Design a protein around this ligand. Structure first.
Ligand SMILES: Nc1ncnc2c1ncn2[C@@H]1O[C@H](COP(=O)(O)OP(=O)(O)O)[C@@H](O)[C@H]1O
Ligand SMILES: Nc1ncnc2c1ncn2[C@@H]1O[C@H](COP(=O)(O)OP(=O)(O)O)[C@@H](O)[C@H]1O
Ligand SMILES: [Mg+2]
Ligand SMILES: [Mg+2]
Lengths: 95, 449, 109, 88, 96, 95, 88, 108, 96, 449
DNA sequence: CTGGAGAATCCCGGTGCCGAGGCCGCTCAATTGGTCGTAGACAGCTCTAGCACCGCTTAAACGCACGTACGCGCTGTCCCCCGCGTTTTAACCGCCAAGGGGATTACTCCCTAGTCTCCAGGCACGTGTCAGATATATACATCCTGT
DNA sequence: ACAGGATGTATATATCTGACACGTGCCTGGAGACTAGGGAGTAATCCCCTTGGCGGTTAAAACGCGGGGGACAGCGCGTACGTGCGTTTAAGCGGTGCTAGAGCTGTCTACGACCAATTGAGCGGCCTCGGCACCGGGATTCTCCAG
């Protein structure tokens, strides 16, 4: 038994949209946050709640950018998102 | 009732004291020095509670994972009339055992690890238990730990602690054990404070201790040697750059960037053990091995004393460490030497652990070195065969080390056990050894009853 | 002196008139603040509070819960055309995404 | 060699392909090209740089070595990225 | 401990029970509700302050807060918020 | 003679991208501003520069929207602007 | 009839097609569809409504019957449409 | 009383330190305001002013005209990446669009 | 009778002459420069005000302006500007 | 030298006075009452300056557009030795005339309109002029006008003003004319103030005026009749709704919306003239119907007095109005009556204007009504044939009306001219007529020299 | 491919003009100098919470291979833009005329901030208990295949 | 076209756990009630600037319609993305110990705001010779088409 291409994916669009959880693993993100900050100032410490504010803000930003990317893909009559659709969304938003 | 052999007179007196606690209706602590055969005193108590009081009811034992196969073996050996069962394994195996063995109620002793209890807590609270034995009871010293909370929710007619290090760091960590045994007596730590020259007054009713130096005059006493070592020139370089906090080191170019140091003490401790623990420190990305590695660590330069030992009869040795990577570099050294060895660690699966212990202990066994991580390998396992102990690292808690040494100094040890402790001379390893000794003073290894 | 009555009780409000007056006086908005300014502002903040909690409580009820949680609040704000304009640039934590799948994407029939 | 068994990736790689796919599924994306995964990492890194640089400017001004939750909330607010839930 | 922390939480709960007597609310949701009240307060007082300055006045009055509400809120919320503010100020003035 | 379709469109782009004049006629826009306003309040008079401030802001907004709209049509592999390209640009902007 | 010779259009129609075409050309548009004129008028009217409504709120607050250049500049500023040249 | 010396002369600036202090004091920015604050702010306002007018002057000479006009200012701000980031949400009156066609639209 | 209106025009003129001695400027370009100076003054002063409230201080000082400048200005503009302002305070405090 | 006919004794005396101004080196104003042949007194002066002083140099005349073809005709008739040329037409025609006629320098008088001067100002400033004659000089009364500025930049040996309404609204307006003539005498209006019972002292040196009542005893004096009229019921309705400002009226539904009234005075003035000027007011979108037009306007109800006049010999009539739409409704009324008529307005082309005037003035002409707009048709044109004048509207400035009446009362009028002025009784038209009469008092129609 | 013709801005030199820089006068906000009182620097202390390591469990991600929906290059198609000229209407600019209403200054007197004093709302605190969680079970959905 | 087979999804019931919910004790911002002195409001004055609309003149909008550009549907082709297997991996959760550095209280003294007094930068008013808009002369040089 194999489901047809595209049916498992729609099931997923439905699950993740219902849930409210964070999707990136948390240890991996904390390490990136800490590496980016070493460039600006050295030897900083971080409240446990401060990295969670960064992760909530980051995942909210990426989910919203993926909506604009999918409308720019469907405008060009495709269902597959591509790097050019991300770039047009970021240009029309002025960033 | 006890079949395969005889309890020594102190084991007989300990049994009579445990029976007297039961008949007086009290719980208590059995805390003989390590290597005094505490295990058999407990197995004999359960035989009594069945053969003489007619109580075949359920009893529980909690143990560290590395000792689950010893306890089971001993039940099978000395008192075969008890019906012991053991919980361990993957989710399917635990579900199958619960369904097909535990709930049927065809057994009288249940043996488990602390993780298996934390997983199956909702199953085990169904039963009403007659005895709850915890081993290495120092594990529950912090009352806010999840095991300590879970363990106080059980229905139990009787409670028992077995530990040879009843004192650990402070009087609150001992009160936390008394509050499991008699919560209605030691109502608070603020009440234990003040009660406290009040030596043995509170303790004698609920504690019994005997020392090998009194009760086993035939066992040879330990010999202890500190070996102070200098740093290598490479270690002296890194130890100074770490203090300055200009380690730099970046494998992805960026002119070496900077390594972050929010905790410098751990970086200094790593360095003392070996420079290669750090990134990019080994010379030559190909790696190469050979004596270049040996020449860069002041501890390893001295560790070639293993060659004298091997030639000096079978002075088989145990090596203890606190860092998992150090066992890696010691294992590459032993493989490059072509030595015969064993290794136990926290990563090891359960089945493998007991096979290793057995293979090393056989009467005709050829393994010279056993490498043990200090947390997983330092508790319960018995290895009377080896004559020597090496402590490569030093722990903030003095009691952790003491236990590790006693893996060898135990009943059945025919020969004097030598303990070698490595210390880098002008470094933070001095302060660590000084504080551990400051903590010994308040304990004083009280002999007690 | 006479026994105290809160200024919120005089205005017929649940939010605090006194705290609001202090906040305004110490926030460096103007060198003077009027007596009716804190009462008008407390009325508006309580009205806007009630508008959100009415929609959030309906969302909790439809989901069969007795307790409002951060997801119920998102659903309320984003399904109301004025609250979603008032709050178009705020991120609510543990607030999900309204469910929407574009039509082109769905299976054929 | 026991000593070299483990190998380390860059910290950007910790944002895995499975982690990006779920975010696009919450956004309602059905199918994704394979070059979108490196493009997304570049975009997040630019977002984190701009928020963190400011959160550290606030921390330095207060003469503290610890970044707090309020330092992050004020930086997001100043850029039009208001966040509720973490105080303020 | 040794330091108090003011919040709107008790006021949000007193209104909750008038709107829905049966329901309760979580601590995470109450923290979002405290953030909403703080954000809206800072918006309305920023427009009021500016209005006074443009017109060269020293005082913020209810007439400046009424205009700030009309500049900030969408049309159906603005007409109701102005009705609730004017009802409160009339009632307050009758007791004063 | 006849130039070819689109040749004079390029001269017009260049000519209007050099000059800074207002392109909409002034008197017709003044009547538009006044009608919209009579719904918000009646009998308003107006400063002459207040109408020029409204025209400058209005032509600046439309020119910028037509640039975002053109990018969208090129993205869809076309050269002619369509009503759906204005709608995509406004939607992605957040209007 | 001399009396009825002239006929009046709506005021939106005053924005003619020749003019929309020029504002597209300043924006670099080469070719335009015939439906855009209706669409562009709808879009400008929504822009003028939102700016004027606020410019009149400011005028009423000042108790004046004349809309000034400053009333327009403050309304554009409050919406993120800052304008230089007309004062302020 | 000694001869007066205006605070801008003491700091070596052309913009007015005294006026900036009044504007800050009466503008509701803080309960108090320090004496070094108007000096720092006047220096930054004069630097940013000189940064624009320098490039505006060059755009005027490129057009061969002696007076700066409002288009010259637009050509300067838009052609510099940092001034265009500082002034990214601003419209300038009598300001044209920088000359530009997407290459897709140019003839073969 | 007719009241005075303040502007930056005479300082803008004196700075132009220092940069390009022979160049002039039209009255409309002056209105735009006067608008620019006021926009940038209001941005810096608004950030400097908040930073003090966040840290619970009642005084605006050169340190709060320095942080405000680093938050608002782009990267290279910020560097040169910071140098110009710290230079001006160094010269002023030598001659106060 | 003058050929076609003989000047009258007052024209002879006026010529001798203009010559005496030239020989004294002064400029001056000729301001005889309208209808007194100022045009010929001027043409005769130029003939003198050529035949007796030997000055054939360039001379300029500025005129209203509607009189350019009269002036030219008169030059051709009385003094054929002057070489007069005329500038008028599209850009190509002006370029062709400048290139092929003006710059050649084969002419001695140049005749132009005020618009043609403002267009060709840079061409005409090349030449050095001997005389600059402005006619209807009241046009330059505001010194801040463009024409007034442009006109003071010319190189001119002599200047001259012709006007029959030398006073208009105030003493500054008259100073503005003196400052063109002798700018070095009347240096300022603050100096003319104070100089001012100072009647004729300043004026006599530089002004001459004669009145028809003194110098043409044979011309019949005017008869003036006010006719007060009530509003129609429809006008009474609109006049009340306009005052309330609840006009409503919206053709695109919207429940009639509201109409904007930033100036109510002009709305009230419109209504008095006719209700149909307003939108949606004429009953029935088809329109077509006609007797209803006469009824819904109190002025039009009375205007059927045109039927008595036509039957009462050829009392041919001129109708003056200030609103162009009113000539529309009067033209539809005349077309629906099948009357014979002419119309002149501001939108008429130049060629057509003079044809109309000629057709109406012919000895055997059959046209009964001439419709004239008051600002274009009210100045310069001569129409001695008509016996009657109707003023449908009333102007704020009294002098505008006076001129319009005089289009008929002039040399060559054989019969008494009747003037009828319509006034709606209880409306703002009362206040307009009262204000215009308040301004007449300060002028007083001074006879002067 | 490409010569040729012929409409496109493009320099060039003259002509006039009200924009911009100069100065005048004199207005009213900056600076000197003194004084007051309290923001904030600073030293010290306490003790919370942020950092490392390992032990142990098992969700999770890794890579492999399989096979199909859909990415995107050519072609034909035939509608609706672009460009021209024509005729046509209304925008721009100049003109006068009136009087709405921005603006000034002046007067008077309601409003709010200040102070001190006072006692009850709101803070954190600690504890019982019930919405919520999730375990097992099944019943009904919807997808997929092959015939 | 649509029969069973297979799968994930729904919800029924059970017991279970840990965030909410009450009330307690406690203490510091809100509230009383006068005096203070300015902002604010309202009168009245003056005269800047906005609303009509004719007259005249050009320019820009409008109409119509020849003709070739681009929009768009369809086909076929082919490799890049979905899917599921088994596999290996590190995130997570717990636990130990240490000590950096957030936080507080009590103390002391540089700083800024304030006042009154004096004087000069900066305001508006009145000015004018020179920047550069404009017109009408010729210069290449854009583009296009029929040889
Ligand atoms: N009575 C006894 N007879 C023989 N051997 C004994 C006896 N008691 C203890 N031992 C030996 O002690 C060793 C382990 O002792 P153990 O029970 O682990 O001590 P503890 O539990 O105190 O660490 C076993 O190898 C066993 O042979
Ligand atoms: N001396 C005269 N002889 C014959 N006809 C004359 C004489 N003077 C004037 N007219 C006629 O009287 C008419 C009015 O003259 P006009 O120049 O229009 O006077 P004004 O210009 O002062 O109104 C002219 O048409 C002219 O033909
Ligand atoms: Mg043991
Ligand atoms: Mg005449």
């Amino acid at each position: 038994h194999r489901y047809r291409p595209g049916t498992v994916a729609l099931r997923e669009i439905r699950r993740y949209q219902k849930s409210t959880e964070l999707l990136i693993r948390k240890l991996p993100f904390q390490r990136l946050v800490r590496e980016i900050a070493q460039d600006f100032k050295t030897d900083l410490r971080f409240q446990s709640s401060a990295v969670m504010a960064l992760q909530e803000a980051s995942e909210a930003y990426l989910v919203a950018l993926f909506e604009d990317t999918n409308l720019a893909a469907i405008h060009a009559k495709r269902v597959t998102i591509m790097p050019k659709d991300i770039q047009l969304a970021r240009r029309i938003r002025g960033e | 009732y006890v079949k395969w052999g005889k309890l020594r007179d102190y084991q007989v007196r300990g049994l009579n004291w445990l029976i007297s606690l039961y008949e007086n209706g009290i719980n208590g602590i059995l805390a003989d020095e390590m290597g005094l055969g505490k295990t058999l005193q407990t197995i004999s108590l359960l035989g009594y509670m069945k053969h003489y009081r007619n109580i075949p009811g359920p009893h529980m034992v909690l143990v560290p994972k590395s000792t689950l196969h010893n306890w089971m073996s001993e039940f099978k050996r000395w008192v075969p009339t008890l019906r012991s069962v053991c919980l361990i394994g993957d989710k399917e195996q635990r579900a199958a055992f619960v369904r097909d063995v535990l709930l049927p109620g065809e057994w009288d002793v249940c043996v488990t690890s602390y993780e298996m209890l934390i997983k199956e807590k909702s199953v085990f609270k169904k039963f009403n238990w007659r005895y709850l034995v915890i081993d290495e009871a120092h594990r529950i010293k912090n009352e806010k730990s999840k095991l300590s909370e879970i363990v106080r929710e059980f229905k139990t007619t009787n409670r028992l602690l077995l530990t040879g290090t009843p004192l650990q760091n402070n009087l609150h960590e001992l009160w936390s054990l008394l509050n499991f045994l008699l919560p209605d007596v030691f109502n608070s730590a603020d009440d234990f404070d003040s009660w406290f020259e009040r030596l043995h007054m509170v303790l004698r009713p609920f504690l019994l201790r005997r020392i090998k130096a009194d009760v086993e005059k035939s066992l040879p006493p330990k010999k202890e040697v500190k070996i102070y070592v200098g740093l290598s020139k490479m270690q002296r370089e890194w130890y100074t750059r770490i203090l300055m906090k200009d380690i730099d080191i970046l494998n992805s170019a960026g002119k070496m960037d900077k390594m972050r140091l929010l905790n410098i003490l751990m970086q200094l401790r790593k360095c003392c053990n070996h420079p290669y623990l750090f990134d990019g420190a080994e010379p030559g990305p190909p790696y190469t091995t050979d004596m270049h590695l040996v020449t860069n660590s002041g501890k390893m330069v001295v560790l070639d004393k293993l060659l004298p030992k091997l030639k000096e009869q079978g002075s088989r040795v145990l090596i203890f460490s606190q860092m998992t990577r150090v066992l890696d570099i010691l294992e590459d050294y032993c493989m490059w030497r072509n030595y015969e060895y064993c290794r136990l660690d926290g990563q090891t699966p359960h089945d493998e652990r007991q096979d290793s212990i057995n293979a090393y202990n056989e009467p005709n066994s050829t393994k010279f070195v056993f490498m043990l991580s200090t947390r997983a390998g330092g508790l319960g396992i018995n290895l009377a065969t080896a004559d020597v102990v090496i402590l490569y690292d030093s722990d903030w808690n003095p009691q952790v080390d003491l236990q590790a040494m006693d893996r060898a100094h135990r009943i059945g040890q025919t020969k004097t056990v030598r303990v070698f402790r490595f210390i880098t001379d002008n470094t933070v390893e001095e302060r660590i050894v000084e504080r551990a000794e400051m903590k010994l003073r308040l304990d004083s290894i009280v002999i007690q009853q | 002196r006479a026994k105290a009555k809160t200024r919120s009780s005089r205005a017929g409000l649940q939010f605090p008139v006194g705290r609001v007056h202090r906040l305004l006086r110490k926030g460096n908005y103007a060198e003077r603040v009027g007596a009716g300014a804190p009462v008008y502002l407390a009325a508006v903040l309580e009205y806007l509070t009630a508008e959100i909690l009415e929609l959030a409580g309906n969302a909790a009820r439809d989901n069969k819960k007795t307790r409002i949680i951060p997801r119920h609040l998102q659903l309320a704000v984003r399904n109301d055309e004025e609250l979603n304009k008032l709050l178009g640039r705020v991120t609510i934590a543990q607030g999900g995404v309204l469910p929407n799948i574009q039509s082109v994407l769905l299976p054929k029939k | 060699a026991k000593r070299h068994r483990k190998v380390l990736r860059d910290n950007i790689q910790g944002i895995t392909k499975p982690a990006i796919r779920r975010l696009a599924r919450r956004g309602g994306v059905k199918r994704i090209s394979g070059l979108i995964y490196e493009e997304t990492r570049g975009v997040l890194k630019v977002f984190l740089e701009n928020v963190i640089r400011d959160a550290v400017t606030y921390t330095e001004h207060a003469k503290r070595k610890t970044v707090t939750a309020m330092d992050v909330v004020y930086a997001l607010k100043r850029q039009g990225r208001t966040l509720y839930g973490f105080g303020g | 401990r040794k330091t108090r922390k003011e919040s709107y939480a008790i006021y949000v709960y007193k209104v909750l029970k008038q709107v829905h007597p049966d329901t309760g609310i979580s601590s995470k949701a109450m923290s979002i509700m405290n953030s909403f009240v703080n954000d809206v307060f800072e918006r309305i007082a920023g427009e009021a302050s500016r209005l006074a300055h443009y017109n060269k006045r020293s005082t913020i009055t209810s007439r400046e807060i009424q205009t700030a509400v009309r500049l900030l809120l969408p049309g159906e919320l603005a007409k109701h918020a102005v009705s609730e503010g004017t009802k409160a100020v009339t009632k307050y003035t009758s007791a004063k």
